[PDB]
Design an enzyme around this catalytic site. Structure first.
Site, PDB file in Angstrom:
ATOM      1  N   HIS A  78       0.895  -1.263   0.109  1.00  0.00           N
ATOM      2  CA  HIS A  78       0.138   0.159  -0.035  1.00  0.00           C
ATOM      3  C   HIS A  78       0.857   1.312   0.039  1.00  0.00           C
ATOM      4  CE1 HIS A  78      -3.186  -2.765   1.929  1.00  0.00           C
ATOM      5  NE2 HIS A  78      -2.922  -3.194   0.673  1.00  0.00           N
ATOM      6  N   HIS A 233      -8.985  -1.636  -4.989  1.00  0.00           N
ATOM      7  CA  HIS A 233      -7.967  -2.163  -4.297  1.00  0.00           C
ATOM      8  C   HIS A 233      -7.081  -2.990  -4.784  1.00  0.00           C
ATOM      9  CE1 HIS A 233      -5.819  -2.041  -0.161  1.00  0.00           C
ATOM     10  NE2 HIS A 233      -5.422  -3.753  -0.583  1.00  0.00           N
ATOM     11  N   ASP A 237      -2.922  -2.468  -4.902  1.00  0.00           N
ATOM     12  CA  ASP A 237      -2.079  -3.459  -4.795  1.00  0.00           C
ATOM     13  C   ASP A 237      -1.133  -3.881  -5.814  1.00  0.00           C
ATOM     14  OD1 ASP A 237      -2.831  -4.287  -2.110  1.00  0.00           O
ATOM     15  OD2 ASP A 237      -4.266  -5.882  -2.742  1.00  0.00           O
ATOM     16  N   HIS A 260      -0.142 -11.266  -4.926  1.00  0.00           N
ATOM     17  CA  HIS A 260       1.143 -10.887  -4.576  1.00  0.00           C
ATOM     18  C   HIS A 260       1.985 -11.871  -5.203  1.00  0.00           C
ATOM     19  CE1 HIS A 260      -0.728  -8.297  -1.813  1.00  0.00           C
ATOM     20  NE2 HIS A 260      -1.344  -8.980  -1.221  1.00  0.00           N
TER      21      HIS A 260
END
Ligand SMILES: C[C@H](O)c1nccn1Cc1cc(-c2ccc(C#CCCCO)cc2)on1
Ligand SMILES: [Zn+2]
Length: 295
Positions: A78, A233, A237, A260
């Protein structure tokens, strides 16, 4: 030319790690040209610095973690998103514990704090990584791709099997990072949250720093900040994970259920494939394919 940026003034803030639940003191400082973003664990003696680079990513489960030996800095994405979104090339980020503070779940508090301090242009050209061939990675039904593009845009598509439902694109030629992405909050589903806590994660999360969803609905009293907050969001990310390249991108990113893990996999394939990218500068801002807001 498009010039490098750093911070004009130092920023400080105090928060809690989303996963660790530990109180943590954060300090961002100016750094010289070509430093990049460097995290420092200042609770340790000596202090342990870990550049915010794809080579230093150690774990990618429910956050992006930087690791150097036994030492980590968890949940960088973030803050990295914010630094990317504001054009910040060089900064030290000191932390008094193992995890960046979550704030309110989003990058909104970081972009506010940064912009209140102010940015400082540096007398050196900003270096960008330009995508010159398509690079994709996949694993099962998840996919992440870089496509050549004269600008910077991000697309994302999530397949959540849930009543509260998504896809979105953003092109920074018309989208404000700040207005349209930065406020999107961290989210999670009650079934995972308990599992995560049983796996000793998610210890700091609450309705104060994340959208909490049960089987049907968002439990946060005040509801959503954007109708498509979840996917916005995911874009947040992904911008943060991509900034681990250590320079802004000229190209397009497309994510399909990626997280991720796959995002880091993509960076690593990219970096390995030197025919697919090249570093460029822009001596005349007027002919460049991107622009930044005033410093
Ligand atoms: C960090 C990463 O970049 C990220 N961004 C969006 C999601 N994620 C993964 C994630 C989400 C959570 C989470 C943990 C606890 C709670 C909560 C709560 C309150 C439950 C008490 O009833 C909510 C959410 O943890 N990791
Ligand atoms: Zn996130």
């Amino acid at each position: 030319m498009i010039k490098q940026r750093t911070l004009k003034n130092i920023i400080r803030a105090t928060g809690v790690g989303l996963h660790s639940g530990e109180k943590v003191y954060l300090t961002l400082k100016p750094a010289p040209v070509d430093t990049g973003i460097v995290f420092s664990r200042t609770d340790l003696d000596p202090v342990v610095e870990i550049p915010a680079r794809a080579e230093n990513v150690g774990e990618t489960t429910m956050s992006t973690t930087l690791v150097k030996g036994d030492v980590k800095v968890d949940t960088v994405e973030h803050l990295l998103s914010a630094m990317a979104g504001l054009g910040i090339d060089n900064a030290y980020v000191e932390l008094s514990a193992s995890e960046v503070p979550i704030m309110d779940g989003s990058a909104g508090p970081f972009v506010f704090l940064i912009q209140s301090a102010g940015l400082q242009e540096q007398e050196a050209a900003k270096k960008f990584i330009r995508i010159k061939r398509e690079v994709s990675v996949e694993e099962g039904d998840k996919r992440a791709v870089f496509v050549p593009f004269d600008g910077f845009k991000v697309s994302f598509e999530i397949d959540f099997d849930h009543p509260v439902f998504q896809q979105a694109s953003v092109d920074f030629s018309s989208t404000s990072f700040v207005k349209e992405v930065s406020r999107a909050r961290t989210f999670g589903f009650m079934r995972d949250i308990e599992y995560l806590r049983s796996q000793n994660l998610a210890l700091g999360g609450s309705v104060e720093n994340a959208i909490v969803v049960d089987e049907n609905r968002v439990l946060n009293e005040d509801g959503l900040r954007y109708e498509d907050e979840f996917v916005k969001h995911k874009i947040l990310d992904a911008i943060g994970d991509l900034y681990l390249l250590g320079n802004s991108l000229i190209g397009e990113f497309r994510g399909f259920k990626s997280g991720h893990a796959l995002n880091n996999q993509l960076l690593r394939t990219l970096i390995a494939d030197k025919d697919a990218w090249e570093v460029v500068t822009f001596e005349d801002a007027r002919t460049a394919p991107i622009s930044y807001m005033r410093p």
